[PDB]
Amino acid sequence: INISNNLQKALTVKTNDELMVIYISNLVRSIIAFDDLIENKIQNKKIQEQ
Amino acid sequence: NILSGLPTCDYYNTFLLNNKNIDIGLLNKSKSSLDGKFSLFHTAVSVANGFMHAGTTDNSFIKANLPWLGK
Amino acid sequence: TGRDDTKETVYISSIALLKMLKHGRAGVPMEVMGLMLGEFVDDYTVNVVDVFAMPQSGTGVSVEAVDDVFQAKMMDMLKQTGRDQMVVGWYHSHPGFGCWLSSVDVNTQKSFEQLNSRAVAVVVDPIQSVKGKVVIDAFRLIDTGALINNLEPRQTTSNTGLLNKANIQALIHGLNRHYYSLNIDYHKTAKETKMLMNLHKEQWQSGLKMYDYEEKEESNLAATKSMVKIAEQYSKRIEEEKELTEEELKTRYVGRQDPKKHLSETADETLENNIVSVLTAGVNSVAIK
Amino acid sequence: TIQLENADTGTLDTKSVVGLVMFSQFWYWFPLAHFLSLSFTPTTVIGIRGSDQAIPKFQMNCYAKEDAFSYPRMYEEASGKEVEKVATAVLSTTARAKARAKKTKKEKGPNEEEKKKEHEEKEKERETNKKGIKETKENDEEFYKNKYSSKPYKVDNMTRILPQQSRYISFIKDDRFVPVRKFKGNNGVVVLRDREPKEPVALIETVRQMKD
Numbered sequence: 099i100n101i102s103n104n105l106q107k108a109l110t111v112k113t114n115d116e117l118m119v120i121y122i123s124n125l126v127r128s129i130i131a132f133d134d135l136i137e138n139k140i141q142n143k144k145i146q147e148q
Numbered sequence: 149n150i151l152s153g154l155p156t157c158d159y160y161n162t163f164l165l166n167n168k169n170i171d172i173g174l175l176n177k178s179k180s181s182l183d184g185k186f187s188l189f190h191t192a193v194s195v196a197n198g199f200m201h202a203g204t205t206d207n208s209f210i211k212a213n214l215p216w217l218g219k
Numbered sequence: 220t221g222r223d224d225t226k227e228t229v230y231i232s233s234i235a236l237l238k239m240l241k242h243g244r245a246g247v248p249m250e251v252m253g254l255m256l257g258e259f260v261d262d263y264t265v266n267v268v269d270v271f272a273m274p275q276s277g278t279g280v281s282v283e284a285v286d287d288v289f290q291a292k293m294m295d296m297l298k299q300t301g302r303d304q305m306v307v308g309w310y311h312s313h314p315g316f317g318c319w320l321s322s323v324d325v326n327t328q329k330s331f332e333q334l335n336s337r338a339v340a341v342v343v344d345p346i347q348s349v350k351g352k353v354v355i356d357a358f359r360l361i362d363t364g365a366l367i368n369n370l371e372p373r374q375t376t377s378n379t380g381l382l383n384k385a386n387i388q389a390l391i392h393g394l395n396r397h398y399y400s401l402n403i404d405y406h407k408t409a410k411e412t413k414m415l416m417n418l419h420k421e422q423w424q425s426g427l428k429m430y431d432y433e434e435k436e437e438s439n440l441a442a443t444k445s446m447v448k449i450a451e452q453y454s455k456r457i458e459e460e461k462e463l464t465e466e467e468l469k470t471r472y473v474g475r476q477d478p479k480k481h482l483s484e485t486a487d488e489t490l491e492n493n494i495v496s497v498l499t500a501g502v503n504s505v506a507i508k
Numbered sequence: 509t510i511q512l513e514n515a516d517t518g519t520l521d522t523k524s525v526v527g528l529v530m531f532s533q534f535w536y537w538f539p540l541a542h543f544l545s546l547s548f549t550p551t552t553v554i555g556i557r558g559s560d561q562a563i564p565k566f567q568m569n570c571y572a573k574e575d576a577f578s579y580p581r582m583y584e585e586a587s588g589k590e591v592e593k594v595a596t597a598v599l600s601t602t603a604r605a606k607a608r609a610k611k612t613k614k615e616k617g618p619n620e621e622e623k624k625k626e627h628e629e630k631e632k633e634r635e636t637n638k639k640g641i642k643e644t645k646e647n648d649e650e651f652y653k654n655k656y657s658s659k660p661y662k663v664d665n666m667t668r669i670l671p672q673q674s675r676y677i678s679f680i681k682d683d684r685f686v687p688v689r690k691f692k693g694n695n696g697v698v699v700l701r702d703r704e705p706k707e708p709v710a711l712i713e714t715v716r717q718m719k720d
Contacts, residue, residue, distance in 0.1 A: 376538050
């Protein structure tokens with residue numbers, strides 16, 4: 099039961115790291131998201147012109 | 149007469165004949181690239197052209213593809 | 220028109236499939252062969268019910284190795300038991316080579332093709348059955364006249380079908396200039412299924428049954444000891460994870476195979492195993508006494 | 509077009525379901541695939557003048573932009589493959605040639621100055637004749653999807669009208685042929701009320717009787 103306890107807890111370590119990692123992925127993707135909005139302004143007008 | 153439905157079909161036939169737009173170039177493009185003695189290629193092209201001239205009794209498909217059908 | 224053929228798919232029953240394997244493994248390296256007893260229905264289903272094995276020759280597989288004399292004798296023995304029907308071809312077994320018919324096998328086949336036009340030649344590979352998939356393929360001669368008129372397309376139409384391969388090389392050469400290969404489905408009824416599934420007397424004698432606790436102490440000790448080592452690589456590793464490009468980090472500081480994934484797998488396997496080990500342990504103590 | 513349900517009554521058509529379920533059995537069998545003609549339904553608004561039960565030509569208004577609809581297409585070009593080949597050739601030849609060309613420019617230019625470029629007194633003042641900006645923006649139409657347009661154009665009866673542009677059809681109040689109630693707003697045969705039977709229009713008869 100004690101080995102099972104350490105192992106459940108080992109799996110929890112691994113997952114809290116995977117929790118932080120995807121959270122960094124989101125922090126990164128935020129920059130891209132901001133930049134995209136200013137950029138889409140230019141594209142809309144061109145496609146309507148054609 | 150109306151409820152029998154045969155008039156409504158007649159009205160639709162007049163429409164399909166006149167206002168049809170079709171690719172006369174497709175028939176020749178299909179012909180060269182896909183062979184008729186390769187059976188699989190024939191099957192696709194026969195079903196493809198028929199859909200194209202659907203709705204209107206046409207002999208356009210026979211005359212374009214006169215030798216191709218007999219293979 | 221003449222007479223116009225289309226696709227067929229050869230349905231090899233459960234009984235026949237094992238029988239072919241049994242015979243082919245045993246006589247190898249020598250080429251082994253045998254006749255197919257079956258019935259032909261539809262225009263798309265060749266039903267191969269049973270096979271049997273013909274005596275082998277040191278002169279391999281050939282026109283004169285089949286033996287029609289032993290066939291006539293074998294036929295009567297099937298006759299009295301209701302297990303005769305009508306012969307639908309032949310099989311032979313190549314060993315390390317692909318599924319394809321040799322020049323000698325064309326001439327063997329041509330004699331079968333006259334007698335019944337719906338004769339198949341079925342190549343078994345037994346030295347290539349060491350995989351989890353048994354490579355088996357079937358062929359059927361297309362007539363010399365037919366190829367000039369390019370009637371191989373004729374056989375392909377009327378379904379998309381699988382158009383499965385499992386071998387090329389020599390196979391595709393031979394295909395051009397002789398035969399048309401047939402895809403394989405296997406038949407089995409809802410009785411045959413249960414027999415197949417059941418391979419244990421450990422259906423009810425495997426949950427209360429267990430391995431000594433010595434062996435469970437070994438699994439526990441190995442498992443805990445190793446996870447330290449995966450944990451020390453993961454510690455060197457995650458001093459990084461803050462530089463440029465994932466792909467670089469993996470090479471240089473050995474992110475390869477993912478040590479994060481490797482520790483999760485090693486923990487998951489022993490974690491699930493011990494719940495079972497206790498679960499069976501306590502079940503016995505409480506129910507038995 | 510293939511229509512899945514009436515946009516009037518909101519209720520399935522028998523022909524259309526039967527079309528598509530049979531059509532998927534084409535992957536099992538190449539000759540059974542001719543049920544996709546059931547799926548097709550021609551789409552058009554067809555006015556019927558009730559006088560003679562034959563098709564009037566008269567003009568209905570469409571509020572819609574003018575150019576947003578055309579019949580597709582035809583594709584050809586393979587003489588560009590030739591053209592590309594002789595284009596790359598002249599261009600590499602000039603680099604090889606350069607040594608000679610440089611002297612050539614000495615003699616050529618004074619001759620042009622004293623005279624003319626060819627038969628014009630222009631496009632030798634500068635590199636062209638202008639050096640100003642050439643950039644222009646916000647030119648041509650501003651539509652790429654129909655949207656809505658307050659511009660009208662008139663369309664003939666029994667022409668191809670998609671169901672995506674059938675809803676903008678309006679019947680002219682200076683025109684006699686206008687329906688009994690109001691439009692249903694969707695494709696299908698609509699009966700027209702003729703005000704005067706004492707003024708004819710050229711008609712288009714039923715053609716299943718013109719083939720007899």
